[model samples]
Target chain A: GFKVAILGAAGGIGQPLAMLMKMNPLVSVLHLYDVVNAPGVTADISHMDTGAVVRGFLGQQQLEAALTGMDLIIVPAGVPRKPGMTRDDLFKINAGIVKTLCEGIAKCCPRAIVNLISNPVNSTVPIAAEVFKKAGTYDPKRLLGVTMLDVVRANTFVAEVLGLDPRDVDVPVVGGHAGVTILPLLSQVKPPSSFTQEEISYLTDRIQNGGTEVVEAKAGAGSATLSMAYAAVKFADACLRGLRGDAGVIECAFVSSQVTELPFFASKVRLGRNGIEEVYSLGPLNEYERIGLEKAKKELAGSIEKGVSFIRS
Target chain B: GFKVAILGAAGGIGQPLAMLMKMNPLVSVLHLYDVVNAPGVTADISHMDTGAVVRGFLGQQQLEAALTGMDLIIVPAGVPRKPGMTRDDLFKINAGIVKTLCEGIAKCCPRAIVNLISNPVNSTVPIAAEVFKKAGTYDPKRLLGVTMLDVVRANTFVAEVLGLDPRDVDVPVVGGHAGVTILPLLSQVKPPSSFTQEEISYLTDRIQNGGTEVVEAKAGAGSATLSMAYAAVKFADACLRGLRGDAGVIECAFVSSQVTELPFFASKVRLGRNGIEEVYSLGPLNEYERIGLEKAKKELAGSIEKGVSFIRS
Candidate 1:
C-alpha cells in the first residue's frame, strides 16, 4: 500500500482522478490538495467505501502537509487552454504553476516519484526537474512526464484502422507530448500486422490531433478531462505496481534518457522500486517513421529548452 | 457482455459514469445520449483503449437510436438541487425529465433493464414505473431505482465508528432515498457487532444526512457527483454480473416489492438474468429502528404517491 497525493485534486481532471485512486487497492492514504474546492472533493470522495483514508488540504497554507511523507505526487494542477489561446500562453501559465508545486514537493517529499501531468508536459517535466535540481533533490529516474494519454490514443486509433481490439494493439508513441511532436510508431504494432501507406497516414494524423478534436467538439465547454484522467490513473497504477516490487511493469513515459541525442524523449521504460530500471531504445523505424521522428525532435527540443530556461534563468 | 446506454451522459455524473461503464469488461457496446455535449463526451471516451464501442446521440431525434438494442439503460439526466430550493421545486423539474426519458425507453428498448438515477428517486422511479405500465411493457423485475449510495455511505460511516475496513462492514439500508425516509438499520449490521444507543443515533443521522453534508460542503459549486458516480458504477457492476449468470449477486436497491405495505422499498435483492430473483425482507429491527420505520413510511408514502400521480394525471 502507498500514500498518494493529487496536487490539483479539485479540477475537472483531478476530481475523477481522485475517485479512481480511491478505488484502487494499492492506495492506503489519499491526499487531495487545491487552492479552492479541495474540501468539497474530499467530502465527496470520503463517502466511498474503499480502503484509502482521505484528507483534504486547502490553500498554500496546507501545501507542505499535503506533500509530506507521500510516496507519489501527481501534478495535474494548472489552467486549461481555451479557444484562441496560444501554446506559449499555456506554457507561460502552467510553467509557473508547476514550479511552485515542484518547490513544495522538493522540500517535503524529496524522494517521492513525481508524475508531471500539467501541460505543456514537454516543458513542465523539465521545470519540475530544474526545481528539484536547485533543491539538490533531483533524481532523473524519479521524475517522469506523463505521455501515456498519447500512447492510449495511438493504440485506439490504430486499433480502429486495423479492426482489432485496442488492448491487443500496442503502438509505441514517442518524441513529445504536444501537437506535431507526437510520434506514433505504427510500424511496430503488436500482433504483427501490416498497413497501407494511406492507412498509416490516417492513423498517425488522427492520434496526433485527437486533443483538438475534443476541444473543437466541446465548442469552448471543456477539453479531454475524462480521458486524461483515465490515462493518468492507468500510469499511476503502473507506478504503484512498480513500487510494489512487481517486475516487468513497462510503460512509455517522457523521462531523462539516452535513447536519442536529445536529453529527454518518450519511450517504453521498465518500472521498479527505484523507478526507470531500464529505458528501451526505439526499435527499427520505417522510412516514414524515421522522417516523423526528425520533425518531432525539432519541436521537442524547443519545448524542453523552454522548461529548462524557465527555472535556470 | 451487454450493450448499455447512459441518458444524460454529458452531465457531471454521467461523464464519469460513461467512463466507468466503458471500463467494465462485461460491456460490449455503449450509447451516450444528452441534449447537449454528447459528441464531446463520446469523442473523449472513445479514445480510451477499452473494449466498449461507444456512440453518441444528441437531442430528441436520436433518442430512439440511443435506446435501441440496449440491454441496460441508466438515467442520471436532470437538474441538480441548488441552494435554497424547495424539494417540490427540485421534483417538479426532475419528474418531467424522468417522464420524457422513460417514455423513450418504453418505445425504443422496452426489454432493457432500467436503472433510474434521476433525482427525487422516490418519485422518479414511480414515474418510470407508470410510464412503463402505460406503454404495456411494465415488468417490476427489470426496473430498479438506485439506492446503493445510501448503503455506500452507511457502510463507510459505520466502519469509521468500528475502526474497520468499510469493505468488511455491511449495513442494510432500507426505506426511501430522501431525508427522513432513508433508514439505516444499525442493529442488523453484518460481521455483527453491538453499538451503544449513542453510537446508533450518530451513525444513523450521518448516513441519512450524508447527501446534505456534501451539498453544504460544496457550498454552491456542485453536488456529490463523483461519489454518486462511484456508488452507481458499483451497483451497475453488480447488476451486470448478475446478468452474466454469476450466482449470488446481491445488492440493496430501490425496487417494486412486497416486503412491506409500500409498493416499493430499498432492500437487499438477489439478481439474476431475468432481473430481480429475490427481494430479501428486513431481517430484524430494534426498538429504535421500529420507531424510525414509522417516520420513514410516513414520508416515503407521500413521495411514492407524488410519482404515481405525476404520470397517472
Candidate 2:
C-alpha cells in the first residue's frame, strides 16, 4: 500500500531490485526511472502478477515526475567501479548522478525516505545531505546510505565460523561503508556469544574486505550487484516497515549523525513512522574493537570531507 | 531445507533467480553452474545473509557435480533470441543447451524435480523427457517446463481490464510456451466473473504477445529476464512446497500430459511429493476458446515433433 520509486531501474542492480520491489506486499505503486532502458525494465517488471501498479520514466525530463508523490525513493543509480579502481575513483561520476537525482527528490518528494546506494556512499551520503541542505529541505533522518551488505557479510562469515544459520547470527557492523571504515563489532554479537581473538581478526578482515572478494571473483566482469541489490531491498524493507508504524524495526545505516566526532556514521538506528527514531550508541567495545574504531574514524574523516567539499566547491 | 541448483547461474535470469533461491527459507544448499562466470555469480550470492550455502560449477566438467545431490534443478540456460527470430528459430541453439543440461540432470540427480526453463520450451520439455527416458530415469511428473510467465502476464492483463488487484485475479494460461502455442483459458475465470467476448479477445491476445511487448520495449537490450526470473522462482517455490509435503499446491506448467491429443501439454496441475499428482481437465470451452485451442495444438505439434526427432536421431 506504498508508492515507491527505483532510480536507475535498468542496470544490473536496478533490474533485480525492481522485480523484488514489485513482488513486495507493502508497495501498491512503483515508478521505475533511468536515463536509458527504463521502459524495458518497466515492461519486464510490470508483467509480474503483484499488487504494485507500475510505470517507467526515462531521462532527466521525467525524473521529478517519477519522484512525485513517492513515499520511498531508492537510488542504486551509479556506475560500477572498473578494474584497478577504488570506490573513491568513482567519486566524480557517481557523485553527480546522486546529486542530480537528489535534487529532483528535493523538488518533488522532499518528505520521502531516500535510500542512497551509489558507490563511495561514505561520500555520496554527505553529497546528498549538502544537496538537501542547499534546497532548504534537508532531513537527516530521511536520507540513509546503505552499508547493509557489511552487516550481511559479517553475519554470513560469523555463521560459517560458528556452523550456525546466518539468519540466527546477529552482527552489528558500524563506522562507514568502505574498506577499513566498515568496522564489525564482534564483541556485541547477538545470541550472547564470544569468539577467540584469532576468530575476531579473521571475521573483521573478511567483512572489511567483502567487496574485494566479490570484485576479484568476478574476474573483471562486475562488482557485487546481486547481493548489493538484496541488501538494498532488505534495508528499504526495514524503512518501509518503519514508515508504516511497525514497532521495533531497527537496522544499521550511514546517515548524518553525531555518534562520533565525524558528521556522518553508520550504526544501529531504530525506525519510526517519520524516519530514524533513535540512533543507538556503539555499546561497550572490547580493546580490539576500540582499536579498530579509531582507524575507521580516521578513514571516514577524509571521505566525509571529500563529500562535503564536492558540493561546497 | 532443500538443496537446489541453477544451471545458468551467471545469465540475466539465473543471477536473480539464484539470489531469490538463496533467500528462500526452504533451501539450505545452492549450486550455481554456467559455462562462463559461475564463480562470479557464486561469490556475489554467497554474501547474502541467508541460510543457503553457495558453490559454483564452471564449464562442462562441473555440470554433474552441481546437479548431484540436488533436490531441484532449474534450467534457464540458453542464448537470447535476436531480431526477427522465432522461438522455433532458437531451436538448434537452445534445444542443444537444454539437452546437455538435461543429460546432466538425468545422470546426476535423476530424482530431482527439473524445472526446464530453456526457450522453445514446447520443444525443450519434450527433449528433456527423451533424455530422461534414454537414461532409464524418466518420470513423467518430475520434468516440468516453466510456462509460469504466461500465467503471470495473463493475471496482470486481466486485472487491468477489471480494475482489480492483480494478486486477486486468477487466470488460467494453458497450452505451450510460445506465440500462438501459448493459450489463456479465460472462459473459466475465477471470482466467478463473466466477460464480454471483446475483453476475452483483448486479454488473450495480450497474454499471447507478452514476450513481444517486452522485446519491442527493450529495443535490443534484452527480453523479459526479470519477469522470467520471478516466474521461475514462483514455479520452483510451488514445487518445493509440494516436495515438502504441503497439501494442495497447484500451478500450471508444460509437462507430459494426456489433457489433449498431444504427447505433452500444459494445464492446471496438482503438485505433490513425487511431482504432478494430477493434471486438471480443460473443463468446458466456449466457441472462441475451442477454436483457439485448435490453433494452439497445430503450432505445438511441430515444436513437439521437432524435439522428439532431435533426440531420436
Candidate 3:
C-alpha cells in the first residue's frame, strides 16, 4: 500500500518527480530504478528525516526489486528530444524504451497502478497495454498516460486570461500530448470560461505548445524539467488521494478507454482505490473546439498508430 | 567556468541543493556526482532550461568526470541524525563520509572552492584541511564549512521578534553545528539590538534547534530537505557572485583560520575568486554572550576532537 517505484528514477523528469513523490505522506517505500544513478538518488532521498524508506535499484538486474511489492509505478525513462527533432524521432527511441520497461512492469507488479510520463505517451500508454495484454495482466483502466501536464497548462492559461486562481480552475484537456493533437475543451472547464475567437486560438496554441515554449525559452540549454515535475506531482497527488479512498477523486489523464472512439484519450475520470472508477464525458464544445477536436483526432490517430506500430512491429 | 560540482549530490540535502544550484544562471555546467543516482539526477536536472549543462558521475570511477573542470564544489552530503541522536552519533558516520569525499575532491578538482555542508562542522572542516594537506592541495582559504544556515536562522528569528525584515537584520553565528556549540553573537549583529534576557534565551534556543523543530513537526517524516535546499542555494548564489570576482561577497562559514584558538571557526568571510579572501573577527560580546561562547567552545572542542580522531587515529 505504500511502495512506489520510478522506472527511470534517474532521468530529468524522473528525478524531480521522485523528489516530489518522496515528499508525499502516502509513500512509505520509494524504489528508484534506473540504468544508472538509481542508488545515489535513492540514498539522497533517504537522507531526508522523512518517513519514506528509499531503496536504489541499479541496472536491469535489480528492476524487479524496484517493482515487486510496489503500490504504484511511474515511468519517465527514455531519451528526451533535442531541438530539430520531431515526435517521430522520439518514437524510434522512446517506444523501444517504453516496451522494455512495460515488459518489466508486467512481470514484476502487474497489479500496481501504472502511471506513464514518458514522451510519445500517446504511443507508450498503448505499448504498456500491449505488454500487459501479452502477459495477460492488462487492465485498461489501470494503465494511465500522464496527460495531467496538458490539463495543468490549460487551467493555468485559462486562469491567466480570466484573472482567476489556476488552482481554482479545472480545464479538462483531451486528445494527445503534441501540437494539433491536444484538445482543451474550454466549455467543460469549471467556473465557466468565455473567450473571444482570438483568445481561444491563442490559448489553444499556447497550451498545445507549452512544452515547446519552455524548450525554446531555455534556448537549447535544457528542456521542461521543473514544469513537468510540477505536473507529474499534481497528478500523483490525485492518484494518492484516490488510493486513500477519498471521495470524488476526479482528474484528467490520458488513458486507454471507450471514453472516445480512439483506444486511448485524456478525459476526466473518477479515481478511487481500484484506480479509475468512472470516467466522465467530454461534455460539450464550441465551434472552434469542435473543429479542433477533429483535427486533434487526426493527429492523435497517427501518434497512436506510431506507438502501437512501434510495439507490434 | 560554469560547471558546479555538488559532492554528495544524492543525499537528503543534496537533491534539493542540486536543484537550486541548477536553477542559477551563473552555473553553466552542473556536475552531480555520488555513489548513487548521479545519471538519473543529472538527466533530471539536465532538462531544466537553465544555462547549466548537467552531467552525472557514478561512484569513484566517475568521480573525475563529475569534479574535473569545476568552478565550485558544494557538499551537503553525509549522515543526517535522527531524533534523539546527538552530534557525536552523526560524527561516527559523517566523519568518514567527509574524509572519503574530501580525498576525491583533493585529487579531482583541487583548485575549486569547497563548501562543506556535512554535520559536525568543527571537525569535518579540519578533516577537509588534513585531506587537502595530504594531497598537497590544501588551500586554507578555499575550504569552507557552510555555517550560513545558523546565521540565516538567527537573523530570521531575531527579526521576527523585532518585527523587522530579516534582510534588514543580520545576526552573526559563530562556532560550529549542534547543541550549545552553535554561538550566536547578538551584540555584533547588524542594526544593533537589545534582547531582553527572556527574548535572548528564547531566540537563541529557537535558532539553535530550528532543525529539531522542523523534524518534530514533520512527526518522523523527512527532515528539512526543502528549507535546507533553499538556504544552501542562497549561500551558493553568494559564492558564485564571489567567484565571478564581484566584490563585497561577505557570508558566514566555518573555515580554517586563527580567528580563535581553534583552527576552524565560523565568521563573516569575504569571498573572492580564490575563495575566502579575509575572515572577520567576532568584534564584541556582552557577559551573556561571552558565557555562551565558552559553553559552545567546550562542546565544539569535543566534536572537533572526535572528527579529527576519526580521520587521524
Candidate 4:
C-alpha cells in the first residue's frame, strides 16, 4: 500500500487520472490538489468503493500539505494543448506550474517518485530536475516524464497494422513525448514481425503525430485527456508495482538517461523498489527505423535543451 | 469477447466509462456515439492499448449503427444536473434521451443488455422498458438502471467508518437509485457487524444523497462523472462477465423486479449467459433496516409511477 498525491487534480487529465489511481489496489492514501475544484474531484473519487483514503488540497496554500509524506506525486496539473497550439505553447504555461509544484515536492516529499505528466515533458522534465537541483533534493531516477502514451499509441497503431491484439503487441517507443521526437522502434516490435516500408512510415508518422490527431479530432473542446489519463494510470500502476518491489516491472518513460547523448530521453526503464533501476538502450534498427532515429534525435535535442534552458534562465 | 456500445460516449460520464469498458478484457469491440464529439472521444479512446476495437457514431443517424450488433449498450446520454436541480429535474431531460436510445437498442440489437446510466434512473429504467415494449423487444432481465454507484458509495463510506478494506465491505444497497428511495440494508452488512443508530443513520443518509454530495462539491462544473463512470464500468464488467457465462457474477442494479411490491427496484442480481439469470430477494432485515425499507418503498413507488406514467401518457 502506498500514499500518493496528484497535483493539479481538478483539470481534465487530473480528474480522470485521480479516479483511475484511486482504483489502484496498491494506493493506501490519495491527496488531490489543484487551484480549483480539487475538493469536488477528491470528494467524487473518494466515494468510490476502493482501498484509497482520499483527501483534497485546494490552491497553493495547501500544495505542501498535499505533497507531504507521499510515496508518489503525479503531476497532470498544467494547461492543455489546443488545436492550433504546439506542445511548446503548453511549455510556457506548464513549466511554471511544474516548477512551483516540484518546489513543493522538493520540500515535502523529495524522496517520493514523481511522475511528471505536464506538457512539453521533454522540457518540463528538465525544468523539474533543475528545480530539484536548486532544492538540493535532485534524484534523476525518481522523476519520470510519462511517455507511456507514446507506447500506448504505438502498441495500438501497430496492432491495427498487424491485425493483432494491442495488449499482445509490444512496441518500444523511444525519444521524447512530443511530435517528431517520439520514435517508435518498429524493428524491435514484439511478437517480432516484419513490416513493409509503407506500414513502417505510416505507423512512425502516426505515432509522432498522435497528439495532433487527438487535438484535431477534439475540435478545440479539449486535448487527449481520457487517453492521457489511461496512460498515466498505466504508468503509475507500474511505478507503484515497482515501489512494492514487484519483479519484471518495465515501461518506457522519459527520464534522465545515459542511453543517448541527450540529457534526457524516453527508453525502456525497469522499475524497482526505489525508482528507475535500469535504463535500456535502443536495439537493432531497420533502415527506415534508423532514418527515424536520426530525425527523432534531431528534434529531441532541441526540446531537451529548451527544458534545460527554462530552468537555467 | 463482447461488443459494447456507449450512448452519449462524448459526455462527462460516457467518455471515462467508454475508456474503462474499452479496457475490459471481455470487450472486443466498442462503439461510441454522441450528439457531439463522438469522433474525438472514439478516436482518443481507440488509441488506448486495449483489446477493444473502437468506433465512433455521431448524432441520430449514427445512433442505430452504434447500438446495432452490440452485446451490451450502456446509456449515459443526457443533460446533467445543475445546482439546485434534483434527480427528478434531471428526469425531464434524461427520460427522453433514454427512451430514444432504447428505441435504437430495440431496433438494432434487441438481444443486447442495456445498462441505463441516465439520472433519474428510477424513472428512466421504466421509460426504457416501455420503449422496448413498444418496439416489441421488452426483456425484463436485460434493462438495468445503474444503481451500483449507490452501492459503491455505501461500500466506501461504511468501510471508512469500520476502518476496513472497501473491497471486503459488502453493503447491499437496494430500493431505488435516487433520494430517499435509495436504501442501504446495513443489517446485512458483511462480517455481521453491528452499528450504532447514529452510524446507521449517517451511512444511510450519505449513501442516499451521494449524488448530491458530488453535485454540491462540483459547484456546477458537472455531476458525478468519474465515480459514476467507475460504477458503470463495474456494473458493465459484471454484465460482460455474465455474458461470458462466468460463474457467480453478481451486482446490485435497478431493474424490473419482484423483489418487492414495487414494479422495479434495486437489489442483488445473479447475471449469467442471458442477462439477469435470477433476481435475489433481501433475505432479512433488522428493525432499523425495516424502517429504512418502508421509507425507500414509499418514495420509490412515486418515482416508478412517474416513469410508468411518462410512457403511458
DockQ of each: 0.85, 0.91, 0.05, 0.87
**B45 Cα displacement, candidate 2 (Å):** 0.7
Local accuracy of candidate 3 as per-residue lDDT tens digits, B1-313: 4568998776667876777787677887788888876555564455443445567778988877777888788888786676666756777788888888889889888888888888767788888888888789999878888877777678767876786656678888888776687888887777977788899899889778876766654454545555466567778888889988999999888888788787777778998888898999877878988898889878777767766667676
Global local distance difference test of model 1: 0.91
Off by over 4 Å in 1: none
The models' CA-based lDDT, in order, is 0.91, 0.91, 0.78, 0.89
Question: Candidate 2 on B1-313: residue-level lDDT in tens?
Answer: 8999999999988999999998999998999999999999999999998988999999999998999999999999999887666756678888899889998888898789999898878999999999889999999989999999999999888888888788898888789999888889887767577888799888888899999899899997688998999999999999999999999999999999999999899999999898889999788888888999999999999989999998989
Ranking by TM-score: 1, 2, 4, 3
Please give, for residues B1-313, the per-residue lDDT of candidate 1 as tens digits: 8999999999989999998998888889999999999999999999999988999999989999999999899888998676667878888989988999999999988888888899888999989999999999999999999999999999999999999999899999998898878899999898899898899999989998998899888886788988898998888888888899999999888899998999989888998997798999988888899899999989999899999999999
Candidate 4's displacement at residue A154, Å, is: 0.7
- The TM-score that candidate 3 achieves is 0.59
Off by over 4 Å in 2: A84-89, B84-89
Clashes found in each candidate (C-alpha, N, C closer than 3 A): 0, 0, 16, 0
**i-RMSD of all predictions:** 0.8, 0.7, 11.1, 0.7
Ten residues in sequence with the least summed lDDT for candidate 2 chain A: A80-89
lDDT of 1 at B292: 94
**Candidate 2: which pairs clash?**
none
Error of 4 at B213 (Å): 0.9
Q: What are the fnat scores of the candidates, in the order listed? A: 0.83, 0.92, 0.01, 0.88
Off by over 4 Å in 3: A81-84, B1-313
Which digits, one per residue and each the tens of the lDDT, describe model 4 over residues B1-313? Answer: 9999999999989988988998899999999999999989987898899998899999999988888899999988999666566756667778878877787898999899999988788888988888888879999989899999999998888988998888999999888998888889988889678788899999999998998898788887677889999999999999999999999999999999998998899999999999999999988988877888899899888888888888888
